[PDB]
Amino acid sequence: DKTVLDANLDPLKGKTIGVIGYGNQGRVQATIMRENGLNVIVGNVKDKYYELAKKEGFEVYEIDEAVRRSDVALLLIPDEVMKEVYEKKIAPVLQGKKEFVLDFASGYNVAFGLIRPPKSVDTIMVAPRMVGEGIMDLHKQGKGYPVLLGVKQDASGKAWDYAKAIAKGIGAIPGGIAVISSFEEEALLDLMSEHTWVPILFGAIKACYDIAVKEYGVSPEAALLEFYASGELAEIARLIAEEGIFNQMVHHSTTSQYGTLTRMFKYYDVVRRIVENEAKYIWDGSFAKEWSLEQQAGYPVFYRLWELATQSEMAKAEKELYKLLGRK
Amino acid sequence: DKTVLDANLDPLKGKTIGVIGYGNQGRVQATIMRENGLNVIVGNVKDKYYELAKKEGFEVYEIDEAVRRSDVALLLIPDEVMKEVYEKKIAPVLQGKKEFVLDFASGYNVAFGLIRPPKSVDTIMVAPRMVGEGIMDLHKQGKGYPVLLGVKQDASGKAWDYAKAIAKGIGAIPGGIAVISSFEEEALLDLMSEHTWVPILFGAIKACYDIAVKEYGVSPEAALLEFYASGELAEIARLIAEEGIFNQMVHHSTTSQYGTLTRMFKYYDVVRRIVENEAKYIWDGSFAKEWSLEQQAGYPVFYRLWELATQSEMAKAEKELYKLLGRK
Amino acid sequence: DKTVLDANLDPLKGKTIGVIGYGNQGRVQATIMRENGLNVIVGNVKDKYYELAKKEGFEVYEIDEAVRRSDVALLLIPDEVMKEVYEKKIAPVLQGKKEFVLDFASGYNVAFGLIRPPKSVDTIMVAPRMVGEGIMDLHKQGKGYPVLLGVKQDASGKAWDYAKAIAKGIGAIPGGIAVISSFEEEALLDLMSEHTWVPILFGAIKACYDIAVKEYGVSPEAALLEFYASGELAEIARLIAEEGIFNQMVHHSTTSQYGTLTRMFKYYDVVRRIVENEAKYIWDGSFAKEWSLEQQAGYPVFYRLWELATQSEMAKAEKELYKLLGRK
Amino acid sequence: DKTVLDANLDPLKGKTIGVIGYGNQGRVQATIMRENGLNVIVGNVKDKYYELAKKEGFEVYEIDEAVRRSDVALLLIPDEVMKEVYEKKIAPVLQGKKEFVLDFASGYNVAFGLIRPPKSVDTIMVAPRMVGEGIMDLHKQGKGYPVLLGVKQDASGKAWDYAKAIAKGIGAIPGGIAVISSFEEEALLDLMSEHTWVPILFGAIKACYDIAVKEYGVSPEAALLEFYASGELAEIARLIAEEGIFNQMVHHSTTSQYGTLTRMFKYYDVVRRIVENEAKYIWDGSFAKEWSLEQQAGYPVFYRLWELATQSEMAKAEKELYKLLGRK
Numbered sequence A, B, C, D: 001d002k003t004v005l006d007a008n009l010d011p012l013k014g015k016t017i018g019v020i021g022y023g024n025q026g027r028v029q030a031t032i033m034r035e036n037g038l039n040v041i042v043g044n045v046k047d048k049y050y051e052l053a054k055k056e057g058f059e060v061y062e063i064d065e066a067v068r069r070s071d072v073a074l075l076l077i078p079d080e081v082m083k084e085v086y087e088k089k090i091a092p093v094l095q096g097k098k099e100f101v102l103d104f105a106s107g108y109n110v111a112f113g114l115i116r117p118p119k120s121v122d123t124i125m126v127a128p129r130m131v132g133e134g135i136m137d138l139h140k141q142g143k144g145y146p147v148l149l150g151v152k153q154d155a156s157g158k159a160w161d162y163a164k165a166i167a168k169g170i171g172a173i174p175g176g177i178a179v180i181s182s183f184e185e186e187a188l189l190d191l192m193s194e195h196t197w198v199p200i201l202f203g204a205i206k207a208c209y210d211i212a213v214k215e216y217g218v219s220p221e222a223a224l225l226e227f228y229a230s231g232e233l234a235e236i237a238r239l240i241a242e243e244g245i246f247n248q249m250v251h252h253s254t255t256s257q258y259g260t261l262t263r264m265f266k267y268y269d270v271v272r273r274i275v276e277n278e279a280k281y282i283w284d285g286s287f288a289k290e291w292s293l294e295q296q297a298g299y300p301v302f303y304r305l306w307e308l309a310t311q312s313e314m315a316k317a318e319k320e321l322y323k324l325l326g327r328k
Ligand SMILES: NC(=O)C1=CN([C@@H]2O[C@H](COP(=O)(O)OP(=O)(O)OC[C@H]3O[C@@H](n4cnc5c(N)ncnc54)[C@H](O)[C@@H]3O)[C@@H](O)[C@H]2O)C=CC1
Pocket: A023, A045, A049, A076, A077, A078, A079, A080, A081, A105, A106, A130, A131
């Protein structure tokens, strides 16, 4: 199928590579590649992470300097401010180039047009789905991890093979896999999760707490223990990742199975409508507007919601309890 | 009535005039006026259009220089960025003046307060309704064209006569006509069209295509031919402009007349509600906010909708077909 | 694909052809075919058009006489009364035949069963999409035009090749194209347009006028100029036919693009429902009933709506204005 | 105001007049005019009414003969079939004329386009509002009655003075009055009554009977006596015509006044909506279609409703009762 289990490493050997950032990915992928036999460099804001980068033995010039030396550059930095940084300190230098290849971790800025490099640059993506520490927790096992391949602009007829070259350049295949997919799909997917089932889950838990306490005279401690203060969810998620989402439930009681299945098929349409609405809202570009403007305004809503969440009854009770159990 | 069929040319003879821009209008109106016996100048961004402007024999200083020399200035440039340009490079110079007269092509920026010149400047508008090439396609015929007159600020008791002086200074009357109307009316009108019947028309066509193909098993080619790939609409519009909208239909079949009339009077209320909503949305200033913010954010929605429109089935089919017919 | 770019001319050479009518199509297609090397005749009501037909050098017997001489006949006459004329003056003669081929310009009467010739006649259609003058405006250019091919009844196993023979017999391919499609598709398409986007467009324009005048104190002249009294729509339609519907908008302002796209995607569902309703109403045969009965009753609704449209405020204002501009 | 209290009689003296029909109006108006000093004739179907017409001393040729002799003709015949009769036996003769003037009693057929005489005939209306016997019940009193003047087509610049000449030619002014009004207004008005308050009244009475009998155990006799079997309504209507609709109520009890006024102002909106709907239905021409088709089909609905009304309980009870009181 569309999957790729391993591929070549030719087009990157003989060229220099530009690594922008030394955070989670930057450090991991950079060290991996250096250990994969390639000449590489680093670009970074000269701060604590720069200390750590030059510590681990990576020559780190300024950003634009690392782009002048490299014919490839990977922008392993945030998604909320990258626009300005590209406008000022990268776009000029890039205009001073021919045959360049720019690859990102997230498609937010490109899928929505906030960054439009010239037609003189093959534009690509790949993105893994971990938080990043799992990838060393797998590399020391000699394993490989899964990722999502994308190409935005092709000015060399080689963007795809460059894609797989990079892929193998970071230690994903062989050992994991590599999927191919537009910038658009990656962004859509990453945002659907953050907008559909995570918040629904959290709101459901909060509602259960509130109800159980204010309408059935229950002790906060017991509610917290049942819903999330226990590690039940973690084990369930592990079993899901191992065996499968449904086959996981064989280790439960028949009562749990029955209730879960019935109520799942009973409420499927509601959440379906919700997911439709949110996915549409994303496909159109509305959420990117919303979020960019919330930055420009000074993050008021962010602030207020962070406050309301922590000043809620559930959070205070969780505080007292976690204190009791010694949990920090 | 409020119309004016021709008027004087006195207050502009003896004065210098400031022409900002050499695009469609700028070039046409400027050449017309030079050919109407007036001393004029040009202000322009020094680029290809500046090449063409100095080509056609118009001394072109910098913007602010052309405003220092002139006691009148006309801002024949876009509507999305004009704000900043006025703030930086025009407002200072203007503060260095007394007795100035500023006229625009569109009232967007003034009707909504994005540009508020001092009380030391008679502020006016006029705007034609063509795309611009029709006006030479009429001037070489010695004809005149119609326009909309507006006055925002009067500090000389002469703004209206300056208005008609300008009017005749561009070759509209005699030969066409000149209407008088606020900045507000012009903006309201130009935006109602772009928000009510153009998009409704396009959506209706798209829906007809989709339905005919996915529910009645029709070939894309035939659908495209019927709906818009033919020049039927062009001839209809021409006859409308010539004879009248309804009298135009006498050249149709009685079947078409009957169906059209019945369905027109049948759906009038719906579109009426829609038009009410949109006109209200405009009168209040909401759309200007929406659009300015969409600029500040980086044009995400614009980008995504441009993509969705071109990646639609109808567009791909139109591509294949137009290729077949040799149409570029 | 289903398209055909040129084909044979064999089955019509050696046979006589029956041309019923000398209107727009009749004259054009008849002259074309005579100029394509075929023996042809004409059938016509002996009136001014008969004068013009015998003028241009076409022997014109009576209808039934032209059918007795020909083994093919094409009924290039209206769609509202053709039924009776076929019942009286054509059905008998046709019953006096074997091996006949009848082709029409519109499928209304056949797609809905108002005319059911015998199984002794291969029954076909083709229909172009112009108004008719464009076809000489193309033939003098040596070009060809597009059309829609259909076969209703096959009693010779040759109906399709007769179809393409006729096609080339009228100067469409080579130079244009020829699509194949049932009688049903042609009728459905021609009627969807006349019922969905034309009347919606007109009602939207009318509503905009009414609103702008009665709720924002606008002068009728300016409204008329903006909405349709200008030739803006004609140029837009031309660019659509030339470049494409969406690519056409690149010549507009970004403001117009943004508003149009947003409002198009915002109102797509409403017009979709409307189009569904009307297409269903047509597929079932209801509209044909409606229209036939409106004929039998004496055209009352037709009359009254024609009156209401012309006695509207917009029409009177358009009258005064068109008078001012010299437009007849 | 628009009223006219008396006028001239000149244009009709010296000309012959064509009177079509000898029914209620025909006889009355014809005898009046003969008694007003004018040369007149009659056209009639040769039947009992023809017997009566030639009885009263009016030479009566055939219809077309009476139109050949006259330069004016008045069509004092029904509204359901007049179309055909005009098509066959009047349109030809009329085509054989120049300078003709046709006046009707009702605008149904003309206001809706079922009869469109040539531009060689000044087309007019006037219509009285009685049933016809009241007009002799007034003429023997030397009085005059009110009527509604209308002009459809003017080919002599004299249609209005012909109108008033006719008016005085029938004994309406002086003594009554004459209003001027389109064909459209007359038809609209005559049909609104027959569709709004007459049927509402009857349905209300019927509902009151049904309710009182089936939910409060009342004797049919008493219900019939209260609601309509008494002549209460007749006296009320007389007082309305004499004094005024509201001033009429001073002769009632305060209880009746209070209840009537309160419930009138309480239900005004409902009946207003109903009247709006029906008036719209008429203005468009829909009802004329409905009624013409009900003729063409054979009057099924008419028949069935006539049956249901007479086979109702109320009608049978009214039968028994009217029998008791000797009323036929
Ligand atoms: N756990 C996560 O957050 C994951 C993040 N990603 C992607 O990697 C990127 C990193 O995300 P995070 O590190 O979590 O965000 P973060 O909030 O931790 O960003 C902190 C870093 O951004 C720099 N920075 C902050 N503001 C800056 C400014 N105005 N100008 C220049 N530099 C500035 C700082 O130097 C600092 O090193 C994101 O774009 C995301 O798309 C992908 C997988 C998981």
